[PDB]
Amino acid sequence: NEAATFGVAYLTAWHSLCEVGRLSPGERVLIHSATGGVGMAAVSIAKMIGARIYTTAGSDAKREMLSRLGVEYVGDSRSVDFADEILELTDGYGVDVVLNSLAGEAIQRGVQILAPGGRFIELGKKDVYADASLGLAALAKSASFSVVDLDLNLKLQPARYRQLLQHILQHVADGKLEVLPVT
Amino acid sequence: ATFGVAYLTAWHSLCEVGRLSPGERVLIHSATGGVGMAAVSIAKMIGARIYTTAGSDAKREMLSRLGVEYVGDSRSVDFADEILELTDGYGVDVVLNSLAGEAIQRGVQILAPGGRFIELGKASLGLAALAKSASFSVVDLDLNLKLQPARYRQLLQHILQHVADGKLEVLPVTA
Numbered sequence: 093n094e095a096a097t098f099g100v101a102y103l104t105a106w107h108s109l110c111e112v113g114r115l116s117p118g119e120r121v122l123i124h125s126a127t128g129g130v131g132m133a134a135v136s137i138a139k140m141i142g143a144r145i146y147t148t149a150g151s152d153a154k155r156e157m158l159s160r161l162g163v164e165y166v167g168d169s170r171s172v173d174f175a176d177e178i179l180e181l182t183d184g185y186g187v188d189v190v191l192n193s194l195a196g197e198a199i200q201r202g203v204q205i206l207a208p209g210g211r212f213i214e215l216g217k218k219d220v221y222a223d224a225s226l227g228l229a230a231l232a233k234s235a236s237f238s239v240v241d242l243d244l245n246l247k248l249q250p251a252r253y254r255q256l257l258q259h260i261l262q263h264v265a266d267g268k269l270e271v272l273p274v275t
Numbered sequence: 276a277t278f279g280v281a282y283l284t285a286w287h288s289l290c291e292v293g294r295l296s297p298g299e300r301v302l303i304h305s306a307t308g309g310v311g312m313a314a315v316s317i318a319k320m321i322g323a324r325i326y327t328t329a330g331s332d333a334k335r336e337m338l339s340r341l342g343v344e345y346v347g348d349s350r351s352v353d354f355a356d357e358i359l360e361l362t363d364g365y366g367v368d369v370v371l372n373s374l375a376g377e378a379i380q381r382g383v384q385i386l387a388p389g390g391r392f393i394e395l396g397k398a399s400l401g402l403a404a405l406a407k408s409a410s411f412s413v414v415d416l417d418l419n420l421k422l423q424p425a426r427y428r429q430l431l432q433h434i435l436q437h438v439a440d441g442k443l444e445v446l447p448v449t450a
């Protein structure tokens with residue numbers, strides 16, 4: 093129940109960032125809608141890893157609540173302004189991995205700010221990119237586009253996720269992973 | 276391709292980016308080439324099921340003696356249906372690709388849920404085809420070496436340790 097929402101949020105953030113994103117220490121990770129379940133899980137895990145965290149949120153209170161967590165950036169999730177704001181903040185480097193859950197122009201804008209070796213991770217529903225396409229030139233600089241549908245993964249590899257969920261809980265249990273709160 | 280370029284390309288594409296796992300299915304195009312053969316060696320070590328492709332009879336015959344799951348034609352695109360038919364519609368878990376044009380589109384189409392298509396080679400990509408937790412990754416070794424020489428220098432030592440340990444049997448290029 094509330095036990096499933098937590099598991100689903102942490103399994104998605106962990107699988108996306110650690111296994112598919114290869115997020116390593118000091119890398120820059122852009123997390124959209126960071127205040128959401130999956131979003132705070134991603135921030136939490138990102139802090140465990142030691143990455144540079146760039147976030148995004150829809151209201152002042154939520155954005156203000158993210159800046160209190162001590163992140164290097166907090167943008168507007170309802171806008172595309174984040175792309176230029178981040179390029180300006182990193183002198184053009186951009187980001188190494190993007191945990192995306194936003195629809196529209198944000199997908200194109202997100203890919204565009206990937207630094208060489210960048211990883212874009214799509215968590216959005218199949219309808220956010222259904223009839224859409226990606227120009228392979230955008231990935232030329234050793235970049236990648238990865239869709240992650242946790243609901244599907246669970247069905248196909250139930251056992252592999254039960255152990256990953258114990259693995260994560262063991263981390264929290266022992267204090268190697270701090271579960272960050274909302275407010 | 277030299278040993279360094281072959282194994283660095285293959286290991287970074289199959290292990291780091293590709294995440295090849297014991298039992299998974301991997302399609303390796305032009306498998307008799309340098310990168311291709313390093314790719315087969317690493318797959319062997321991992322314990323993956325190997326699906327290959329080669330540009331001539333002599334080369335396909337060479338792949339067959341290695342004992343693999345499939346040996347198709349790289350100057351064709353038939354490999355897509357032949358594999359779906361051979362794997363009962365499952366398709367493949369990861370595709371190491373160096374072929375062009377339709378081979379890519381057809382190669383992305385046969386990824387199994389959770390599939391990883393690594394493009395080594397060289398043109399849009401329909402995102403719907405990546406819906407079942409699939410991905411598309413471009414690997415440019417030269418660019419990578421230039422940007423993270425130290426990380427790659429260290430990966431080469433990691434690979435060479437496996438070779439020295441007898442864990443990674445290096446299959447020679449029968450060319």
Ligand SMILES: [Ca+2]
Nearest residue numbers: 179180181183
């Ligand atoms: Ca400027």
